[PDB]
């Protein structure tokens, strides 16, 4: 693998992909939150469920995307996914606040994004062997910057037009992504049998449960208990900014650690995440809460950026796609289950402390689980003792 030269343009295209997808998701969610700000309607419960459904479909459809990628190729599947996403996002505008919006913006957009996403992770493997960590770090950092820039691009740099045309405007991004997908030049049911991969995937899935609770409830908590604050947009901006640097440095360092020993980084990350999450209620002064948010954002990147390189390490290149597909499919449920459970706890108790207390446990349990992943040599010793 060149691990250089041309590969950079592929990295650029993948950055564009991720930035468009997650950027859109978050922007549309914020827009809906803004429409419900002053009016009961403009359906509330279903409106909230719509975004969750769209986000979930990305994780839920990964295995079938894996099959299609393996049997057709990264380029064709990526192009088809981009085309479907564009069609869905364009037609959603025609649907004027009707249940048709449910169907289109959920099914069409989610399935399109799911088709487009996984190849954006697989293709990099073909072009990087001794620097894949740095490439993934760069892709994540670029995508994060793109997402953080998207709302500035929409709200203030434009959006002089009524709300109905916002989807139409957003469509062009997916069209451009469809064009970019043509650059994925191809250079060249059984994965679960491996004990190591099974354990790792199960641990990650278990940790994933208490993941979105901070992002979804921090603002409400701060407003509830720190109304004296002028504005609380600072925390989210700071978390994103630190997450960018965390992702980049994590990708750069991951290549240093050889072999499976990379997993120890994830272990530490999880531990820190759990502790900080449990620590938010304690800190009773904003001056400390901001620092805790800083550290949370810093650990988030160290966690996210590493999953793909570890997968390639565990299963090799010829099976990375299927492993990633199954791993994402296994994360479908807990991520959705998290925030609603936190909300139920908040209703049951009233104070918001118990929500974060609960949210802090799953990552610790995940760290403990990952701590016991056997090494290859020990697998061989097991086999020997089997004979």
């Amino acid at each position, epitope marked *: 693998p060149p691990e250089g030269g041309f590969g950079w343009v592929v990295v650029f295209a993948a950055t564009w992909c991720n930035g468009s997808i997650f950027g859109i998701h978050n922007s549309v969610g914020i827009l809906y939150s803004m429409l419900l700000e002053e009016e009961k309607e403009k359906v509330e419960f279903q409106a909230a469920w719509v975004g969750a459904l769209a986000m979930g479909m990305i994780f839920f459809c990964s295995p079938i995307v894996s099959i299609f990628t393996d049997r057709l190729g990264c380029r064709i599947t990526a192009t088809a996914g981009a085309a479907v996403a564009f069609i869905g996002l364009h037609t959603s505008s025609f649907t004027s606040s009707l249940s048709l919006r449910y169907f289109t913006y959920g099914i069409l957009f989610g399935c399109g994004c799911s088709f487009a996403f996984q190849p954006s992770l697989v293709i990099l493997g073909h072009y990087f062997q001794r620097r894949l960590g740095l490439a993934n770090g760069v892709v994540s950092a670029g995508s994060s910057i793109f997402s953080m820039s998207f709302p500035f691009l929409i709200r203030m740099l434009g959006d002089k037009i009524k709300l109905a045309q916002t989807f139409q405007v957003l469509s062009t991004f997916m069209f451009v992504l469809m064009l970019l997908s043509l650059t994925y030049r191809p250079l060249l049911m059984r994965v679960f049998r491996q004990r190591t991969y099974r354990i790792w995937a199960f641990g990650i899935a278990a940790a994933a449960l208490g993941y979105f609770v901070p992002y979804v409830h921090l603002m409400k908590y701060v407003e509830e208990e720190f109304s004296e604050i002028k504005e609380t947009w600072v925390l989210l901006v700071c978390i994103g900014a630190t997450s960018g640097l965390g992702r980049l440095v994590s990708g750069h360092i991951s290549d240093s650690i050889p072999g499976l020993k990379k997993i120890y980084l994830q272990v530490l990350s999880f531990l820190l995440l759990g502790l900080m999450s449990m620590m938010i209620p304690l800190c009773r002064d904003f001056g400390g809460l901001i620092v805790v948010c800083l550290f949370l954002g810093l650990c988030d990147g160290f966690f996210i950026t590493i999953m793909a390189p570890i997968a390639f390490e565990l299963v090799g290149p010829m099976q990375a796609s299927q492993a990633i597909g199954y791993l994402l499919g296994m994360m479908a449920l807990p991520m959705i289950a998290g925030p609603p459970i936190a909300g139920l706890l908040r209703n049951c108790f009233g104070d918001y402390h118990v929500a974060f207390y609960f949210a802090g446990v799953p990552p610790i349990i995940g760290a403990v689980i990952l701590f016991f992943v056997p*090494s290859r*040599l*020990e697998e*061989e*010793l*097991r086999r*020997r*003792l089997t*004979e």
Partner: nanobody
Amino acid sequence: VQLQESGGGLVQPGGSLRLSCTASGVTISALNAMAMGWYRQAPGERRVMVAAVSERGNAMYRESVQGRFTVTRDFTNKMVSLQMDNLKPEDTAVYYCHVLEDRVDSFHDYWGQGTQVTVSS
């Protein structure tokens, strides 16, 4: 890799016996990349691993002989000591020092000059 088993002989039932040898023809650094262990072979049996210590320092046993068998590893001195207690007649066999070395998508299993051990009254 060179090995020379020290210890063995006849023991009474319920007795104790300690085997140990120093890795030869291998450096400390190389050894730490290897798993030290032992092999059992009774008359007519095939040589089979019974105990070993991992790269990560973990000890692992064949559960049948666990407890009655014990292994400890001193990486500095390149020493692995196979302690055994509560010996029984079924344990009679020749035991061989072994080193497992990892290689590129492959492994190398080395053998020592085994020592006979018998358990009878």
